[PDB]
């Protein structure tokens, strides 16, 4: 069906499409949608995947039509999966889009190579096609504060919409709920969702194919502490994927659906005076929408807060606003309402009291005790619980029936004096081997060993960034066993101290001894007065690396995307520049060209 038609039949004039993988763009597109009403308009949001964007040329059939795109960027400046189709259409079309009015707010991250490439492309492309831009491209940077970037952009978008179409601010800034509660006092267990995603009993009754809507419940066969310290916890997990038909290659990611901490869930129900065990269903008031429920329903509040809702990340400002109405104490309600301001003391207190203090929902309800919202409203405001991604640490050629994970457990004390715990890592940490099921699925990536086994590989991955390389080395050794010629295999690893967080020390030492690992160069950053990192070791090896590089070797960089990846790339620029005799700007082009040839791959996060 045509989305243009859908709009006509439902009285909508504004449509906001979201390109989203972890729900942020979606929630953004939703907030925009509910906003239409405050300016004499009717909006709806949509998943472009469910429609045909070629229908865009029919928008003029609706008076005052306005389309907005909230797009996030992924792997190498690529579109999220639900926008892939739209992308492909944008590239092969030359359709005349005169008369179409648009606005684009891109969700991206500066620490990545191709920053906000999706939004930039969509925005640049609609114009080339003939459409009319009504408001500047929004560049949301998640390395800074995406939320503020977004509210700053919205605050300027609406006025520009008002001006252009000749509409006005009703000022009816009141509150509206998307869903209505329905208690299920009389229900069977076979009818109640218990944390599974997609269809009911999908966890209990496992049938392929397994994906993000149908996760395969893998058994934890191994789960061992990797480091000797006790200040931190680094672990190696082995999830048994036998009988799942699931396939993967070293370089691919493994995603998992965690559960929130039991206690935190109880502290929540207890402070809200809510019987967490009540089964219920929240139903969408707009009987036209596909999204009938904010999460699988019916289901108990307990199940909802443990498996479907994010209760740990600092809430976005729109969530702090709606809650403000359930705070009786004047000064406590003052605080919460103000934090929604774009700037002034509102942005200040928001960034400081919420974000920097890393205050989760329970922390808020705690430091503003007069605040007492109903639990069902909260369930509609909170974001969905996302799966977490990990770089598979196994080679499917050695471990076809197992998927390995190397992770560091997140736990830190906040300025608010609280102890915060990462959701998936603590959860994975409590899974006992030899009972203990992890819901997971494999996501393909372009991170891959060279096509030819003889091509040399330069791997750089300190800390948990060593994960995909453990698989690479396993595979490379296995390739030598199959009696094939294997090029040089170098791993530039790093950690703080050799007697603390040296991950896989034995396994890596054995590999080098067996000859599979051509070289093992490790940088201990805290064993001497000053810092010693991987980019230092790369510098010292300037000669051999230039040789391998000019020879056609493949470079791989995995781990921290904030500083490490950037410093390592600057070191590689310096190598090419100093030894290629060319200029630094030329070295930069050189390294960028390698990325496009598939010979300089990145697997970084933060
Ligand atoms: C593609 C990809 C590959 C990845 N590969 C791996 C991997 O192989 N191994 C691995 O360990 N991780 C990897 N991750 C990260 C992983 O997916 C999770 O983000 C990480 O394990 C934390 O998840 P969590 O649920 O335990 O923490 P969450 O509950 O999600 O909280 C995480 C957030 O806590 C905050 N935080 C952490 N430390 C502090 C601090 N001390 N002070 C203030 N804030 C802090 C940060 O905002 C951090 O983003 C990867 C991520 C991606 C996207
Ligand atoms: O996360 P995780 O626990 O996997 O990693 P992590 O333990 O935080 O860091 C792993 C290694 O990377 C080092 N490092 C920090 N910043 C770096 C940089 N900018 N460039 C290269 N190496 C850097 C760390 O040294 P320091 O943490 O001692 O700087 C440590 O030696
Ligand atoms: C695996 C991965 C790859 C990413 N790649 C990019 C990228 O190439 N460019 C960019 O600007 N942002 C990149 N980001 C950041 C996201 O665009 C940003 O976090 C966005 O807020 C996610 O929105 P969503 O929840 O609506 O999908 C990446 C994030 C992840 C997790």
Brief write-up:
With 606 residues, the protein is α/β, with parallel strands linked by helices. It has helices at residues 3-9, 24-35, 84-92, 117-128, 146-165, 262-271, 301-308, 317-323, 330-338, 345-356, 361-367, 375-381, 423-429, 467-481, 505-514, 534-540, 542-550, 564-580, 584-596; strands at 14-19, 43-46, 66-72, 101-108, 132-141, 179-183, 216-225, 234-240, 253-256, 279-284, 299-300, 388-391, 402-408, 411-413, 419-421, 437-443, 457-460, 489-495, 519-524, 554-560, 600-605.
Describe the structure.
This protein is an alpha/beta fold and 606 residues long. It folds into four domains: 1-172, Flavodoxin domain (Rossmann fold), CATH 3.40.50.360; 205-258 and 385-447, Elongation Factor Tu (Ef-tu), domain 3 (Beta Barrel), CATH 2.40.30; 259-384, Up-down Bundle (NADPH-cytochrome p450 Reductase, Chain A, domain 3), CATH 1.20.990; 448-606, Rossmann fold (3-Layer(aba) Sandwich). The protein has helices at residues 3-9, 24-35, 84-92, 117-128, 146-165, 262-271, 301-308, 317-323, 330-338, 345-356, 361-367, 375-381, 423-429, 467-481, 505-514, 534-540, 542-550, 564-580, 584-596; strands at residues 14-19, 43-46, 66-72, 101-108, 132-141, 179-183, 216-225, 234-240, 253-256, 279-284, 299-300, 388-391, 402-408, 411-413, 419-421, 437-443, 457-460, 489-495, 519-524, 554-560, 600-605. The strands form five sheets. The protein has a six-stranded antiparallel beta sheet, covered by helices on one side. It has a five-stranded parallel beta sheet with strand order 2-1-3-4-5, sandwiched between helices. Strands 19-18-17-20-21 form a five-stranded parallel beta sheet, with helices on both faces. Helix 6 packs parallel to helix 11 (361-367), helix 17 (542-550) packs across helix 18 and helix 18 (564-580) packs across helix 19. The chain is globular, with a radius of gyration of 26 Å. The structure holds flavin-adenine dinucleotide, NADP nicotinamide-adenine-dinucleotide phosphate and flavin mononucleotide. Flavin-adenine dinucleotide binds at residues 253, 312, 358, 388-391, 406-408, 410, 412, 422-425, 464, 467, 605.
